[PDB]
Amino acid sequence: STAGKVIKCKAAVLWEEKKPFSIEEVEVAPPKAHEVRIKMVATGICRSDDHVVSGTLVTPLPVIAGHEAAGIVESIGEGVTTVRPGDKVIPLFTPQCGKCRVCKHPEGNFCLKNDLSMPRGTMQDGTSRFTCRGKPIHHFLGTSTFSQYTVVDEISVAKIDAASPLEKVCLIGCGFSTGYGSAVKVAKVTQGSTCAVFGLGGVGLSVIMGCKAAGAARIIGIDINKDKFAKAKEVGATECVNPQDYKKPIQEVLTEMSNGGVDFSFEVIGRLDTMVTALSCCQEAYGVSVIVGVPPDSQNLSMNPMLLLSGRTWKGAIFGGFKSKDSVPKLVADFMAKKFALDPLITHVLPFEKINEGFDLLRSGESIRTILTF
Amino acid sequence: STAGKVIKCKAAVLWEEKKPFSIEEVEVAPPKAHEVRIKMVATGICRSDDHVVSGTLVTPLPVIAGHEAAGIVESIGEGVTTVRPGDKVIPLFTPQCGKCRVCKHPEGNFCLKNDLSMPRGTMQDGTSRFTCRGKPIHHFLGTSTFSQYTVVDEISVAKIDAASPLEKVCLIGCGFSTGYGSAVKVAKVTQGSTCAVFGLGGVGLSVIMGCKAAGAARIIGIDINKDKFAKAKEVGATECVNPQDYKKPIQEVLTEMSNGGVDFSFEVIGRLDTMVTALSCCQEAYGVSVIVGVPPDSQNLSMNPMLLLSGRTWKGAIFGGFKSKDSVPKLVADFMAKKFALDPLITHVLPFEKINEGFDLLRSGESIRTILTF
Ligand SMILES: NC(=O)c1ccc[n+]([C@@H]2O[C@H](COP(=O)([O-])OP(=O)([O-])OC[C@H]3O[C@@H](n4cnc5c(N)[nH+]cnc54)[C@H](O)[C@@H]3O)[C@@H](O)[C@H]2O)c1
Ligand SMILES: NC(=O)c1ccc[n+]([C@@H]2O[C@H](COP(=O)([O-])OP(=O)([O-])OC[C@H]3O[C@@H](n4cnc5c(N)[nH+]cnc54)[C@H](O)[C@@H]3O)[C@@H](O)[C@H]2O)c1
Ligand SMILES: [Zn+2]
Ligand SMILES: [Zn+2]
Ligand SMILES: [Zn+2]
Ligand SMILES: [Zn+2]
């Protein structure tokens, strides 16, 4: 009975940077042509959502953030062919339009319809489906999952297995897939190699999972929070190092430990300095370094291009390099077949209403992923 | 007979930066164990040699520069097994020791025995074979080809076809192989792709040759000297553009020309700004940019890592990525089998005694390669 009607529901609205979310009533318009309205079931708290709050990642405010989630289709707009009401779905923060030059390219995944490069905070048609206190509210990355209901473009949703546990598979919408793909797809980590992973949060742990799945012999985790080391070892780190323990810069330490540099390094934090350190610590002639972390808005790094001239490869990726709509259902199917584990990433569970406590847990260093249930 | 004896011969000594070469008598010691003394036949003038003069590339002075050459073995030290007196050879400015982790890696070529990273200007044993006016003179990259005779370590020399024309194949010692390999091996240019080549000197032309050999559909040459365009088109450029002709930055122009960014870009100049421009003009999700130019000593570039996070790959290489001792003989064989051309790169042929005139032709923009003949 809600099809074609405005839904009034609770969402977590971010009115201002550096402030708590406000859990309050919003109006969610019905889906227009090629749009899908989703009843959310679970959403994860990713550091990128916190970047919205801190101004690290600039997107228009006020906003409904959230991008790592799973839910059930409530209704579909005219012309939608890929999902139906009642289907389990994961919103895709990187769309897959299937039509642009990137979508057509065998390697590419950063579809040109994305709202990450130059965020507008709208639907594809340049408008918003959200009203709060009578005011229009921005979308985030075409997903906006911190709401009991959201509306997404069809190119920003994937149908997943009907028997999927949504409180787990939501992590396939961002943190797991990003880290795992960064290792297996972007870096193409090789059997017997030595990897260095900077940052041992949910995404970095997923990188470790991918490096172990790819057969790396050594996986060195690097974090300034030694509380992160036990879980990193559980999921495959062979050793962990805290830069604060050393007199020398950590790129030197890692070069020494790896007898001349690592095969693959990953920056999974979001700092300009660690991006350069991670490049430097890979072997100068054949090493590969992948940037995963999101840097502070509009800031440039400084580096010596001799690091590249000797033979290093430097790359980055969004969402692990995965073409989103093709890949998410397959990743869920693989999860259901026990090909990888998600539980190691889930440290806390809270109701959606305790979203602010969830962010407190992330900011204190205590959590990896908190999953919020609607 | 000269074997076992000091040779007094003519060489071009660089006594200090930013001065002409001094053409005068030097003494060349006989080769020690695992060393090879070569009578030079032809040597090219590479921009990297000019970088030694200009202080762009730092290496100990005084020095016998020159690294792109071909000659004939005069004698061998004890224990040499890979060349014999009378063999045609190309000195290898990047060695191939065959033993280090890089030499053993399938994709590495920047052998750890190189003298490029931390130049000492000596033989592998830390001593010099050259004296001039009673003073020791440094080697350059283990080669020192601006001399009628040089001494090189065995790991820094390759035997080539006895029927080779040395006045042409000397280019395989640096500029040809560097450009060609940067395209075919390091970038792995694909059939039907669009490439952008910044800098249309000898190395850039060789990058164009490689892009064409790989089947690129479009090859855009970029240079501030429009006199370089005719030859660039002869060897495969489909379009040429001069940044000075445009009101907008050339990365914007190139992005527009390529309907959203090129597949492969190459920096073949040695400027920090063009390194960043070249990265920026490749497609943000799947583009690849290769740094070939040598930048000014100790200077860092500034760049926004979002350029990489979207999906770009940035890499550099020495000597086109080629494992030097394995590759040089095969390249010469390929040249003899007419698989590529070298004549388009050679604009001037001068006696060795005219080295300074050869450098003046480079600096003025008038030459591609001058070959000096002994
Ligand atoms: N490329 C993508 O598509 C993508 C997707 C998901 C997340 N991200 C980004 O990836 C990064 C990690 O996300 P996350 O795992 O959720 O975050 P997180 O849980 O905050 O983990 C980051 C880790 O970095 C550690 N850390 C902080 N400073 C340093 C330092 N100087 N040296 C070493 N370790 C340090 C910190 O202790 C923490 O455990 C963030 O910047 C995200 O915005 C990118
Ligand atoms: N990586 C290696 O192993 C390797 C080997 C050989 C050469 N190099 C370097 O490659 C570079 C090219 O060498 P080369 O071809 O002998 O030099 P070159 O013949 O001087 O060619 C450089 C070209 O760049 C052009 N140029 C200068 N400034 C600009 C600009 N702003 N925008 C566009 N074009 C510009 C210039 O007009 C010239 O045609 C030099 O830096 C060499 O030191 C590197
Ligand atoms: Zn697309
Ligand atoms: Zn995320
Ligand atoms: Zn070696
Ligand atoms: Zn050179």
Please name the residues in contact with B38: beta carbons below 8 A apart, sequence gap of 6 or more: B71, B72, B73, B74, B89, B91, B149, B150, B151, B152, B157
Give the C-alpha separation, A314 to A310, whole Å. Answer: 12
Residue B45: C-alpha distances to residues A62, B137, B170, B308 (Å): 62, 20, 10, 35
> Tokens standing for A204?
């970095």
Q: Among B117, B259, B302, whose Cβ lies nearest the Cβ of A310?
A: B117
Which stretches within chain B are classed as H helix?
A: 47-54, 101-104, 166-169, 175-181, 202-213, 229-234, 250-257, 272-281, 306-309, 324-336, 355-363
Question: DSSP characters for B317-363?
Answer: -SGGG--HHHHHHHHHHHHHTTSS--GGGEEEEEEGGGHHHHHHHHH
Query: Could you tell me if A103 and A96 are in contact, meaning their C-beta atoms sit under 8 angstroms apart?
Result: yes
Nearest-CA neighbor of A91 among A52, A35, A49?
Answer: A35
Give the C-alpha separation, B283 to B260, whole Å. Answer: 6
Output the known binding site of A. 46, 48, 67, 97, 100, 103, 111, 174, 199-204, 223, 228, 292-294, 319, 369
Nearest-CA neighbor of B141 among B131, B155, B160, B162?
Answer: B155
Give how far the C-alpha of residue B180 lies from the chain's centroid of Cα atoms, to the nearest Å. 11
φ, ψ at A315 (rounded to 5°): -145, 170
Residue A220: C-alpha distances to residues A66, A217, A238, A313, A354 (Å): 31, 10, 6, 19, 35
Question: What was the structure determination method?
Answer: X-ray
Give the C-alpha separation, B193 to B291, whole Å. Answer: 18
For A331, the 3-state DSSP assignment is helix
B288-291 and B264-267 beta bridge pairing: parallel
User: At how many degrees (to 10) do helices B250-257 and B272-281 cross?
Assistant: 20
Please name the residues in contact with A279: beta carbons below 8 A apart, sequence gap of 6 or more: A265, A289, A303, A307, A312, A314
For B368, the 3-state DSSP assignment is coil
Give the C-alpha separation, A172 to A165, whole Å. Answer: 11
A1-178+318-374, what's its fold? Quinone Oxidoreductase; Chain A, domain 1 (3.90.180)
Scored b (16 or more CB within 10 A) or e, A55-85 reads ebbebebbbbbbbbbbbebbbbbeebeebee
Residues of B with CB under 8 A from a CB of A: 101-102, 105, 107-110, 112, 117, 259-260, 272, 275, 283-286, 291, 294-295, 298-306, 308-318, 321
A98: left (phi over 0), alpha (psi -120 to 50) or beta: left
- Listed by start position, the domains of chain A span 1-178+318-374, 179-317
**Chain A residues touching residue B262 (CB < 8 angstroms):** none
Question: How many of the other CB atoms lie within 10 Å of CB of B317?
Answer: 26
Which amino acid is present at B322? F
Query: Could you tell me if A189 and A195 are in contact, meaning their C-beta atoms sit under 8 angstroms apart?
Result: yes
| Span between the terminal Cα atoms of chain A, in Å | 20
Give the C-alpha separation, A75 to B290, whole Å. Answer: 48
β-partners of residue B371 are B44, B349
Question: How many of the other CB atoms lie within 10 Å of CB of B356?
Answer: 15
B301: left (phi over 0), alpha (psi -120 to 50) or beta: beta
Give the C-alpha separation, A222 to A238, whole Å. Answer: 11
Tokens 């790959």 appear where?
B313
In chain A, beta strands by DSSP E: 7-13, 22-28, 35-44, 69-76, 88-91, 130-132, 135-137, 149-153, 157-159, 194-198, 218-222, 239-241, 264-267, 288-291, 301-303, 313-316, 346-351, 369-373
A5: left (phi over 0), alpha (psi -120 to 50) or beta: beta
Nearest-CA neighbor of A117 among B276, B314, B247, B283?
Answer: B283
Give how far the C-alpha of residue A74 lies from the chain's centroid of Cα atoms, to the nearest Å. 25
Nearest-CA neighbor of B210 among B223, B197, B228?
Answer: B197
Question: How many of the other CB atoms lie within 10 Å of CB of B100?
Answer: 18
Question: Where is B152: in which H helix or E strand?
Answer: strand B149-153
Q: Is B202 annotated as a binding residue?
A: yes
Scored b (16 or more CB within 10 A) or e, A208-246 reads bbbbbebebebbbbbbbeeebbebbeebbbbebbebeee
A239-241 and A218-222 beta bridge pairing: parallel
β-partners of residue A262 are A282
Give the C-alpha separation, B210 to A24, whole Å. Answer: 61
Give the C-alpha separation, A338 to B356, whole Å. Answer: 70
Nearest-CA neighbor of A180 among A189, A170, A190?
Answer: A189
| Span between the terminal Cα atoms of chain B, in Å | 20
Residue A40: half-sphere exposure toward Cβ, Cα within 13 Å: 31
Q: How far is the CA of B270 from the centre of ligand 2 (A)?
A: 6
Show me where chain A is broken: residue before each gap, C-N > 2.5 A: none
Question: Where is A175: in which H helix or E strand?
Answer: helix A175-181
For A219, the 3-state DSSP assignment is strand
Scored b (16 or more CB within 10 A) or e, A93-103 reads bbbbbeebbbb
Residue A75: C-alpha distances to residues A40, A79, A146, B13, B287 (Å): 13, 12, 18, 81, 38
Q: Among B300, B306, B317, whose Cβ lies nearest the Cβ of A304?
A: B300
**Chain B residues touching residue A192 (CB < 8 angstroms):** none
Please name the residues in contact with A8: beta carbons below 8 A apart, sequence gap of 6 or more: A25, A26, A27, A28
Torsion of CA A158, A58, A294, B260, to 10 degrees: 70
Please name the residues in contact with A6: beta carbons below 8 A apart, sequence gap of 6 or more: A27, A28, A29, A30
Torsion of CA A124, A126, A128, A129, to 10 degrees: -40
**Chain A residues touching residue B260 (CB < 8 angstroms):** 101, 112
If you measure CA to CA, which chain A residue comes closest to B267?
A309
Give how far the C-alpha of residue A99 lies from the chain's centroid of Cα atoms, to the nearest Å. 23
> Tokens standing for B88?
């045609």
Query: Could you tell me if A160 and A90 are in contact, meaning their C-beta atoms sit under 8 angstroms apart?
Result: yes
> Tokens standing for A374?
């609607």
Give the C-alpha separation, A120 to A97, whole Å. Answer: 18
Residue B336: C-alpha distances to residues B60, B164, B240, B343 (Å): 37, 7, 30, 13
Nearest-CA neighbor of B123 among B140, B111, B136?
Answer: B140
β-partners of residue A90 are A158
Which stretches within A214-312 are classed as H helix?
A: 229-234, 250-257, 272-281, 306-309
This structure's resolution (Å) is 1.2
Residue B301: C-alpha distances to residues B114, B187, B275 (Å): 24, 21, 8
Which stretches within A85-133 are classed as H helix?
A: 101-104
Pick the CATH number of B179-317 from 3.40.50.720, 3.40.50.20, 3.40.50.2000, 3.40.50.1820: 3.40.50.720
Tokens 């350059």 appear where?
B140
Residue B16: half-sphere exposure toward Cβ, Cα within 13 Å: 1
> Tokens standing for A232?
């990193």
Scored b (16 or more CB within 10 A) or e, B193-224 reads bbbbbbbbbbbbbbbbbbbbebebebbbbbbb
Query: Could you tell me if B54 and B296 are in contact, meaning their C-beta atoms sit under 8 angstroms apart?
Result: no
Give the C-alpha separation, A332 to A171, whole Å. Answer: 10
